[PDB]
């Protein structure tokens, strides 16, 4: 039944980029207060299957286009909020609404897209949220302002478990090519021009970019987790003007640069779209493949590109102004030729201590993976695909094996104190000790496990305080240490629950 | 497979009797030279089965409506350049391009409709053209100019005798 | 009527490094199997059949397990630093942290796979630069290392691409 | 079908070790242009099992032999074109043109000799030569300078990969 509504108030001049609104899904539901909000007092937990609903006029003459992004973990709000690049809100969980199709619906299984339970009486991570916001403009502003209806409609039953089915779960070797949420902001064609060239790079692994602002998301994770790939773009076309715009698209895929002989373009193996519609163009390259990320001063346009051409158009009656935009979707790599998985079944850098400036120094690890921060040492961070998972996901858990390597600063027969790692359960205050470990500086290196979670299951990408075991690296001859550096290698079934994304 | 192209220049106000321009086919076959043109220098001679293609953005707000009139002996191109008369530009084989349909296709059976095979290194005859008018002109002007596209699909292949079956 | 195999399925020599004139040296081998050279210490390059494969093939792709030995120029009661191994994935630039690796200079030995590859599948046996796995030795004390060596053992299915030849 | 052709000029006093020219394998199908090389452009890569055929008037009379040698990767072009030495030309694959048996034909699969698929708008790695040189002489000149014709004949597909089956 419904569950909660809430009001999302549309301007009479929608420009691309405008912010709409934020509902908070959990005040939507508790607002309306709600023969659901009712049953949920009593679960104490609820793992939903919602449908949304969004209520909203049909019509073929604006152009419009929407998209709703399912933000369960707060991580695009504050940087949307003057004004919307795509490149945030499509980050998340997402779902274009056009407005040629009127009212919009589809469902949100909590228990996959988000990954912890509901509780009653307040939010555990962070309170999740839809935002909304314009990827396409009107093509000219509309009489005057409107609003458009959200509805939740659920049948909220008592959670059984904390935790959801995990969305990912940690494997070098494991990319299928098959992708979710990969939409690609708008590209625009002036009417001005009888034809024109928009590229798209297909060099997927790249992070996206707005400003200096660079948007951490699980697609180009993904991606990175491989070398190179090679085989069938197939993806979906989506046309956003008014019915009386229209166009006809060349699309196919280039290397290195366009050829800017008609004729030849015409030779390639490309496809028409005239309309809405799916897709498939081979990625072009004389290795077959195109590479995963870029090396220094590359461009993505020296790889393979899915280019879209328009032979025909766009045209519109007098006097219209607008471009016309176009929305590309990739589903998959189908008929895939993939390369050598980036990285193997093995240790990867987590940190490396350098430069250390006390004798005694103690860094407290506790049960998270995370970045590390001193006053009082140089502090070096990896960068790989797991660190990424870890930043685009709202929860995870597992165990990392650890390896420690250090090498000496002062003489080798001068040479005393240890590498301790301290292992506690609880905190360095009240806890009980487990397996610590004391290694003579002189062993040059030791091992350890560390568990990444605690008593509720998960950890947030947060600092939180949640009972769990403890552990610490302890320095006392610090200063005779050149560098300290921390591999680990995730145990099978290290999880992730809920895709998102990480802005910095 | 596509065996050669072209492109018409359409004005933003398109009125009736607009004549559009002339494409020429063997041209069109020669410049792009072309897989399939290259089947042909060995062929010799051809008499194509073409599938003609008008790349072409549909659209139901303009009133427009084209005709492509197939001109294999060059007789009318000579009194429609500055303007086309319908009279003119129905008088031989054609087809009606209408604007809300979007992209337009229609086959060409050279044998019948031209009746002698074409020649790789020169015309023989005169030089078969398709000619692009305008029959009905568009409401009110559009944004601006545009394009359409012009294809000639054909699987070439060499033909055994000079003549076609006559038409008559 | 064969004799032995001249080689068993062993590690052989890849390169030695010596006399080393700066206390920091790197040396960059990134994905690639080929000649050193340096201007600030010794290179002397190991001959054996391998290395001849590799020169007599145009590509070529497999992985190499590394085994490192050195020995000390100064006193082992003195010495400090290591011998590291940096493990990327694109270039020194913007490239990704793999399982790079600190050998504390006492140690005197370690091992480490070289992945001799890149997302198109092989290599040329001349500079490129194709997007791949990427290493490097890092000497921070180098001048109390009497002698680097590197030795190699191919893992089963390394593979050569088009026999040929090579002149020097 | 024939995919590319050239010619090497023989003079009339051909000596051992004369040099007589290079092919350029990808030049020769470009340059022609070809049913099979507008085929290549649509597939992008190629992986061809040539034919080769070297047109020669046979002749019993002079003792002429030639070599014909496979350089995909262009590692004797530069030592050969002063004075081609057998060591150089037979160091690649290659094959004997004997004089008395006239017209020479063999097949080159790419695949096995070369190892990497052909991209139709630039040379990858390096760029695949036939080399035509002398092995043994003529018994005494001809009456004249003369030519010999090379051709390729090849179905050209799209490649599915970008690399062939590893030679070792």
């Not at 640069?257 to 004389?286: A, C």
């Not at 650890?402 to 009240?430: C, H, P, R, Y």
């Not at 568990?451 to 947030?460: D, K």
Request: charged fraction near 20%; proline fraction near 5%.
């Amino acid at each position: 039944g419904l569950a909660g509504r809430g009001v999302i108030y549309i301007p009479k001049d929608c420009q691309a980029n405008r912010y709409l609104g934020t509902l908070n899904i959990r005040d939507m539901i508790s607002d309306f207060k709600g023969v659901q909000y009712e049953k949920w007092i009593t679960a104490g937990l609820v793992m939903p299957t919602f449908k949304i609903v969004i209520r909203l006029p049909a019509n073929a003459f604006t152009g419009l286009t929407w998209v709703m992004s399912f933000d369960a973990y707060n991580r695009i709000t504050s940087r949307i909020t003057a004004s919307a690049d795509p490149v945030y809100t499509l980050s998340v969980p997402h779902w274009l609404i056009h407005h040629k199709l009127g009212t919009f619906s589809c469902e949100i299984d909590y228990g996959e897209l988000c990954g912890h339970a509901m509780w009653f009486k307040s939010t555990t991570f962070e309170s999740p949220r839809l935002h909304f916001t314009c990827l396409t403009g009107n093509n000219k502003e509309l009489a005057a302002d409107w609003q458009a209806v959200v509805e939740l409609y659920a049948e909220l039953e008592e959670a059984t478990s904390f935790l959801g089915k995990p969305t990912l779960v940690f494997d070098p070797g494991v990319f299928n090519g098959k992708f979710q949420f990969l939409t690609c902001p708008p590209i625009f064609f002036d009417l001005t021009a009888v034809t024109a060239l928009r590229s798209a790079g297909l060099t997927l692994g790249q992070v996206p970019m707005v400003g200096t602002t660079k948007v951490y998301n699980l697609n180009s994770t993904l991606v990175s987790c491989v070398l190179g790939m090679g085989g069938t773009v197939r993806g979906r076309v989506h046309i956003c003007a008014p019915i009386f715009y229209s166009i006809v698209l060349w699309v196919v895929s280039e290397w290195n640069g366009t050829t800017m002989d008609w004729n030849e373009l015409f030779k390639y193996p490309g496809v028409y779209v005239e309309e809405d519609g799916s897709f498939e163009v081979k990625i072009r390259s004389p290795y077959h493949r195109t590479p995963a990320r870029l090396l220094a001063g590359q461009s993505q346009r020296d790889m393979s590109s899915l280019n879209f051409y328009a032979i025909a158009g766009p045209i519109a009656p007098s006097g219209e102004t607008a471009q016309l935009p176009i929305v590309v979707q990739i589903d998959e790599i189908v008929r895939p030729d993939l390369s050598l998985p980036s990285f193997e079944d093995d240790y990867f850098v987590w940190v490396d201590f350098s430069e250390f400036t006390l004798d005694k120094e103690e860094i407290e690890i506790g049960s998270r993976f995370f970045d590390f921060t001193s006053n009082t040492c140089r502090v070096s961070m990896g960068e790989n695909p797991f660190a990424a998972m870890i930043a685009c996901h709202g929860l995870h858990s597992g165990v990392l094996d650890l390896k420690l390597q250090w090498s000496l600063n002062t003489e080798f027969g001068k040479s005393s104190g240890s590498v301790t790692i301290t292992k506690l359960v609880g905190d360095k205050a009240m806890g009980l000790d487990g397996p610590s470990h004391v290694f003579a500086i002189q062993k040059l290196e030791g091992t350890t496990e560390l568990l990444v979670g605690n008593f509720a299951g998960a950890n947030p990408n947060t600092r939180f305080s949640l009972y769990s075991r403890w552990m610490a690296i302890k320095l006392d001859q610090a200063k005779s240490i050149k560098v300290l550096r921390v591999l680990c290698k995730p145990r099978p079934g290290f999880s992730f629950y809920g895709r998102t994304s990480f802005p910095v």
